[PDB]
Amino acid sequence: NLDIIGKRIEKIKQEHETSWHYDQDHPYKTWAYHGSYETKQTASSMVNGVVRLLTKPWDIIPMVTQMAMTFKEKVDTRTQEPKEGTKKLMKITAEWLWKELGKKKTPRMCTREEFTRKVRSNAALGAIFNKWKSAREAVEDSGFWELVDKERNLHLEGKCETCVYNMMSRAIWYMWLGARFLEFEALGFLNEDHWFSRENSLSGVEGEGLHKLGYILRDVSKKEGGAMYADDTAGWDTRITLEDLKNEEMVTNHMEGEHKKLAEAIFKLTYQNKVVRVQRPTTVMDIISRRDQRGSGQVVTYGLNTFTNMEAQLIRQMEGEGVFKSIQHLTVTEEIAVKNWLVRVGRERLSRMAISGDDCVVKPLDDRFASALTALNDMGKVRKDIQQWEPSRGWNDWTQVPFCSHHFHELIMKDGRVLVVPCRNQDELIGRARISQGAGWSLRETACLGKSYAQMWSLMYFHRRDLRLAANAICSAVPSHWVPTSRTTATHEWMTTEDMLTVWNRVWIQENPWMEDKTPVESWEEIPYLGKREDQWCGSLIGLTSRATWAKNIQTAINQVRSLIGNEEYTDYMPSMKRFRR
Ligand SMILES: [Zn+2]
Ligand SMILES: [Zn+2]
């Protein structure tokens, strides 16, 4: 408690010594409360006018239009201590999993140089605005790095002064850039060196890309076993136990020298003990603490969520296969059985899963998995939208399974080659492309964000009639040489000024390991769509009068946007489609 967090607490006290007060009407039950001080401040979702002017039929679809308008009683809940049998299963599995992940990788520190290059091309590193304006500026000033130095030597000394969380089913904890550096220095290797790649982790999909995920689920489907299970956890980040944070910290067992000590400090001082500032309207800032739940950077959060989810799902597989009988207590011979299962079939069982942070798909040995719930519930990973002891419902068809907000279609090209393509309800895709985040967007910057969405649709969602047409319209309406942008950036092959047919060939044919025949595609007309009825099932407006008038009159919409942007060099991409090709 207060020895590890006191100094952070003491320091904040004094920068608002005029305002400090132990409020007696504080709302916190599960968070330790420490005090309050004076503040007054809040970024809402703005419409992208380039995308909206070129998607007129969707102006009357509430599922699209409502997306642009507008639980903190889950961050204030408490998960119970798992039983001794559960704690043993987790410690054995975590020990084995770090060794497997470490067999072909070397833990290492990430560098000021690496951190600097990141900030100078806009990665979402969840920092705050004070002393310098942006992250770009702090990184060039040696004063910052002296602040970083003071904190760093404090961490070597087992103490913390400035690593404090700022709060804002989504809750995002920003820290100052300095704290973020020290986190990246110690733990950035997990992401920078692809510890959760599929090649390295067998269950993971880190760096795959949406073009690969369907083929990965189809490969899992080829395994002998039961249904495919895709159970979502209710508020994953809020169910991370102190026991989970201690098994995650065992990655430090693979480290040495300075790095080992820097990583141990991040886990001890910032993860297993946290200090947070929260805005309360009654407007004060509350300084609250707790030991458990997830609050790291979003990129370290991804890797440790993937790790702990891989661990949880192997244990659920062990329960289904009868490896242990009860979570109350592991016998000595059950430990040896668990250890032996991991050595004998561990890697095979990892290959039966696709895991992306809190999201999983599991094809177990058989359907005993469906009712194997005691370890999963006791670890605190309670399933969303099903009663605690009701058996899981599995999927019989890999094309039905939800994963990373998508499902996947098998689509046969006119030449017999097989594409496995990503898909989701088209209202969600159009509604997201119609939204920008933040202020001071020029017309040019708004156009270049529209072009990013359009090129993503050409690469990932070409099989949806409405999105191929809208993508071609947006790319016709935005000057041909303007570079696609995004303020928060998986593999993003659409972020390029290269011709999209050349990029399509490189991704779906040349690089595709599932595609044996490498014959390039010569035109967009060779590239197939879903069935017309399947396109409608997934939200197409094909067949509506509104959509027919939009498609027929698209050159008028393209010309409206060109007239707003002004006299620039444009390309007509509409004749790449059969119906505009005269
Ligand atoms: Zn610190
Ligand atoms: Zn679909």
Which residues lie closer than 8 Å to 228 by C-beta, 6 or more apart?
217, 220, 221, 361, 362, 363, 394, 395, 396, 398, 401
Can you name the residues that pair with 261 across neighbouring β-strands?
none
CA of 133 to the centre of ligand 2 (A): 44
- How many A from CA of 422 to the centre of ligand 2? 7
Which of 249, 274, 292 corresponds to the end of one domain?
A: 292
Number of folded domains that form the chain: 2
8-state DSSP, 140 = T
177-187 helix and 112-119 helix, angle to the nearest 10 degrees: 120
Cβ burial of 497 (10 Å; 0-12, 13-18, 19+) is exposed
Asked if residue 310 is part of any domain, the answer here is: no
Whether residue 163 is found in the same domain as residue 62: no
Same domain, 26 and 63: no
- How far does the centroid of ligand 1 lie from the alpha carbon of residue 72, in Å? 26
- Give the ranges where 222-297 is alpha helix by DSSP (H): 242-249, 257-265
In a domain, 341, yes or no: no
Residues 62, 181 share a domain: no
CA 505 – CA 512 distance, rounded (Å):
9
- Report yes or no: 360 and 309 within 8 Å, Cβ to Cβ: yes
How many angstroms separate the Cα of 196 from the Cα of each of 229, 236, 288? 21, 18, 33
Give the CATH number, domain containing residue 34.
3.30.70.2840
- What is the Å distance from ligand 1's center to 242 Cα? 19
Both 287 and 414 in one domain: the answer is no
Ligand that comes closest to the CA of residue 163: 1
377 located within any domain: no
Please give the C-alpha separations between residue 98 and each of 1, 256, 278, 292, 308, in angstroms, as whole numbers. Answer: 28, 15, 35, 21, 11
What's the gap in Å between 277 CA and the centre of ligand 2? 42
- Looking at the domain assignment, is residue 333 inside a domain? no
Query: Distance from the CA of 265 to the center of ligand 1, in angstroms?
Result: 8
Residues 6+ apart with CB under 8 A from 475: 451, 454, 455, 458, 500, 571, 573
Max Cα distance, the chain (Å): 78
Q: What is the structure's resolution, reported in angstroms to one decimal?
A: 1.6
CB 481 within 8 A of CB 569: yes
> Are residues 494 and 563 located together in one domain of the fold?
yes
* 409, β-bridge pairs: 421
CB 520 within 8 A of CB 472: no
CA angle 195, 199, 201 (to 5 degrees): 45
Residue 138: its H or E element: helix 135-138
Q: Between β-strands 274-280 and 165-166, what pairing exists: parallel, antiparallel or unpaired? A: parallel
**Domain for residue 334, yes or no?**
no
Range of the domain at 137: 1-38+111-187+241-292
Same-domain check for residues 142 and 59: no
Q: Say which ligand is closest to the CA of 423.
A: 2
Give the number of other Cβ atoms within 10 Å of residue 499's Cβ: 10
Q: Which one of 225, 257, 292 terminates a domain?
A: 292
Tell me how far apart the alpha carbons of residues 220 and 365 are, in angstroms, rounded to a whole number: 12
In a domain, 344, yes or no: no
Check whether residue 273 and residue 417 sit in a common domain: no
Q: How far is CA 131 from CA 128, 181, 443, in A?
A: 10, 17, 31
Would the CA dihedral through 106, 112, 114, 119 be positive or negative? positive
Number of residues assigned to the chain: 582
CA 314 remoteness from chain centre: 22
Same domain, 163 and 56: no
Residue 206 phi/psi, 5-degree rounding, is -65, 125
Pair 442, 560 in one domain: yes
Q: Which ligand is nearest to the CA of 267?
A: 1
What is the rounded distance in angstroms from the CA atom of residue 36 to the CA atom of residue 20?
6
Q: Which two tokens stand for residue 485?
A: 């942008």
Q: How far apart are CA 209 and CA 205, in angstroms?
A: 8
Please tell me the distance from the alpha carbon of residue 13 to that of residue 91, in angstroms, as a whole number: 39
Report how far ligand 2's centroid is from the alpha carbon of 247 (Å).
Answer: 38
Domain for residue 115, yes or no?
Answer: yes
Query: What residues pair up with 286 in beta bridges, in sequence order?
Result: 36, 278
Technique used to solve these coordinates: X-ray
Cβ-count burial 263-280 (b if 16+ within 10 Å, e if not): bbbbbbbbbbbbbbbbee
Residue that terminates a domain, selected from 276, 292, 308: 292
Are 33 and 132 members of one domain?
Answer: yes
**What DSSP string describes 208-219?**
--HHHHHHHHHH
Q: Alpha-carbon distance 391 to 377, whole Å?
A: 12
- 552 is a domain residue: yes
CA dist 85 and 329 (Å) reads 4
State yes or no: 209 annotated in a binding site: no
247 is in an annotated binding site: no
Ordered DSSP codes for 439-478: S---HHHHHHHHHHHHHHHHHHSTTSHHHHHHHHHHHHHS
Dihedral angle sign, alpha carbons of residues 492, 101, 380, 218: positive
The answer to whether 233 is a known ligand-binding residue is yes
Amino acid at 329: H
Which neighbouring-strand residues pair with 278?
A: 286
**How many Cα atoms occupy the beta-carbon half-sphere of 136 within 13 Å?**
5
Residue 334 structure tokens:
């059950």
384 is in an annotated binding site: yes
Cβ atoms of residues 381 and 215 within 8 Å = no
What angle, rounded to 10 degrees, do the helices at 465-477 and 426-433 form?
20
Q: Are residues 419 and 286 in the same domain?
A: no
Residues 6 or more apart whose CB falls under 8 angstroms from that of 461 comprise: 421, 422, 423, 429, 467, 468, 471
Residue 429 alpha carbon to ligand 2 centre in Å: 12
> What's the N-to-C CA distance of the chain in angstroms?
74
Q: What is the DSSP letter of 229?
A: B
CA distance 200 to 192: 13
Q: Are residues 152 and 288 in the same domain?
A: yes
Determine the distance from the C-alpha atom of residue 434 to the mean position of all C-alpha atoms in its chain, rounded to a whole number. 21
